Amino acid sequence: LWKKTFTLENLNQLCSNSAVSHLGIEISAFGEDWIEATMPVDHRTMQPFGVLHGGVSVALAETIGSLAGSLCLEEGKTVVGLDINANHLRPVRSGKVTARATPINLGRNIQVWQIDIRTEENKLCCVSRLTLSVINL
């Protein structure tokens, strides 16, 4: 559960003028134990032949997962990406995809997050697991 209070407006403002904003990523929604971000599938995020770039899908997964992790810490605490993995399940040709981050294990020094990315038709196109280090900033 979240340890910090936040608003979608402020989170997006926090991600402005960075790789996140550059890829058209928008923190779109959250629940009590999950948070999502959407990303469009267009020339900024597609491979040269017209389908969502799998590498960019991973960029979305690390973004939402890292953000989620940072919201689960108290003051004077932040996360740093240690490693990440993903499986590309199906090609996406249009619309926007939505990546949802849910916690797997939140430890004192390490956090592990799951990220499921779905198409506008609610079909899973990518699944990823992210490992974060917790450090005193």
C-alpha positions as semicolon CSV with decimal commas, in nm:
position;residue;x (nm);y (nm);z (nm)
1;L;0,000;0,000;0,000
2;W;0,110;0,359;-0,068
3;K;0,322;0,535;0,194
4;K;0,302;0,874;0,023
5;T;0,003;1,084;-0,081
6;F;-0,012;1,180;-0,448
7;T;-0,225;1,299;-0,739
8;L;-0,213;1,198;-1,105
9;E;-0,157;1,561;-1,199
10;N;0,148;1,593;-0,975
11;L;0,295;1,257;-1,080
12;N;0,272;1,353;-1,447
13;Q;0,424;1,690;-1,364
14;L;0,707;1,502;-1,192
15;C;0,764;1,295;-1,508
16;S;0,752;1,597;-1,740
17;N;1,044;1,684;-1,968
18;S;1,202;1,339;-1,947
19;A;1,205;1,009;-2,136
20;V;0,860;0,944;-1,989
21;S;0,699;1,252;-2,143
22;H;0,904;1,202;-2,458
23;L;0,746;0,861;-2,519
24;G;0,398;1,004;-2,460
25;I;0,363;0,810;-2,135
26;E;0,093;0,931;-1,899
27;I;0,030;0,809;-1,544
28;S;-0,339;0,729;-1,598
29;A;-0,493;0,562;-1,293
30;F;-0,437;0,387;-0,962
31;G;-0,610;0,160;-0,716
32;E;-0,526;0,068;-0,358
33;D;-0,254;-0,176;-0,463
34;W;-0,181;-0,092;-0,826
35;I;-0,104;0,197;-1,057
36;E;-0,120;0,231;-1,436
37;A;0,031;0,437;-1,715
38;T;-0,068;0,449;-2,081
39;M;0,146;0,497;-2,388
40;P;0,041;0,554;-2,749
41;V;0,136;0,321;-3,031
42;D;0,253;0,556;-3,307
43;H;0,573;0,658;-3,487
44;R;0,733;0,760;-3,156
45;T;0,694;0,411;-3,011
46;M;0,675;0,177;-3,312
47;Q;0,931;-0,033;-3,494
48;P;0,997;0,072;-3,855
49;F;0,741;-0,177;-3,989
50;G;0,435;-0,058;-3,798
51;V;0,412;-0,241;-3,465
52;L;0,484;-0,137;-3,106
53;H;0,858;-0,151;-3,028
54;G;0,917;-0,419;-2,763
55;G;1,210;-0,225;-2,624
56;V;0,987;0,076;-2,571
57;S;0,732;-0,150;-2,398
58;V;1,004;-0,233;-2,148
59;A;1,072;0,138;-2,102
60;L;0,706;0,179;-2,007
61;A;0,727;-0,116;-1,766
62;E;1,034;0,021;-1,587
63;T;0,876;0,365;-1,566
64;I;0,550;0,260;-1,404
65;G;0,716;-0,001;-1,184
66;S;0,980;0,239;-1,054
67;L;0,718;0,507;-0,989
68;A;0,505;0,258;-0,797
69;G;0,804;0,153;-0,589
70;S;0,887;0,513;-0,498
71;L;0,530;0,564;-0,375
72;C;0,565;0,270;-0,135
73;L;0,847;0,424;0,066
74;E;0,849;0,677;0,351
75;E;1,041;1,006;0,349
76;G;1,410;1,008;0,262
77;K;1,364;0,692;0,058
78;T;1,373;0,619;-0,315
79;V;1,429;0,334;-0,560
80;V;1,689;0,264;-0,827
81;G;1,635;0,010;-1,103
82;L;1,861;-0,291;-1,062
83;D;1,733;-0,520;-1,334
84;I;1,432;-0,599;-1,545
85;N;1,303;-0,871;-1,775
86;A;1,007;-0,904;-2,009
87;N;0,830;-1,135;-2,252
88;H;0,664;-0,993;-2,562
89;L;0,338;-1,182;-2,614
90;R;0,177;-1,018;-2,915
91;P;0,222;-0,735;-3,167
92;V;0,025;-0,413;-3,122
93;R;-0,057;-0,198;-3,424
94;S;-0,268;0,091;-3,292
95;G;-0,434;0,269;-3,003
96;K;-0,256;0,292;-2,670
97;V;-0,134;0,026;-2,431
98;T;-0,182;0,032;-2,056
99;A;0,083;-0,093;-1,814
100;R;-0,028;-0,190;-1,464
101;A;0,224;-0,233;-1,184
102;T;0,145;-0,452;-0,883
103;P;0,388;-0,544;-0,602
104;I;0,534;-0,892;-0,569
105;N;0,754;-0,832;-0,265
106;L;0,845;-0,509;-0,087
107;G;1,157;-0,556;0,122
108;R;1,380;-0,333;0,331
109;N;1,651;-0,326;0,065
110;I;1,491;-0,482;-0,243
111;Q;1,150;-0,446;-0,409
112;V;1,018;-0,674;-0,682
113;W;0,735;-0,554;-0,907
114;Q;0,518;-0,714;-1,172
115;I;0,410;-0,516;-1,478
116;D;0,135;-0,639;-1,711
117;I;0,081;-0,437;-2,030
118;R;-0,247;-0,472;-2,220
119;T;-0,390;-0,342;-2,548
120;E;-0,698;-0,123;-2,585
121;E;-0,887;-0,452;-2,632
122;N;-0,760;-0,565;-2,290
123;K;-0,529;-0,835;-2,429
124;L;-0,186;-0,893;-2,271
125;C;0,093;-0,790;-2,506
126;C;0,386;-0,781;-2,263
127;V;0,468;-0,902;-1,911
128;S;0,768;-0,791;-1,710
129;R;0,927;-0,822;-1,367
130;L;1,135;-0,538;-1,221
131;T;1,388;-0,549;-0,937
132;L;1,454;-0,227;-0,747
133;S;1,712;-0,133;-0,485
134;V;1,597;0,081;-0,192
135;I;1,840;0,352;-0,082
136;N;1,854;0,656;0,147
137;L;1,871;0,962;-0,078
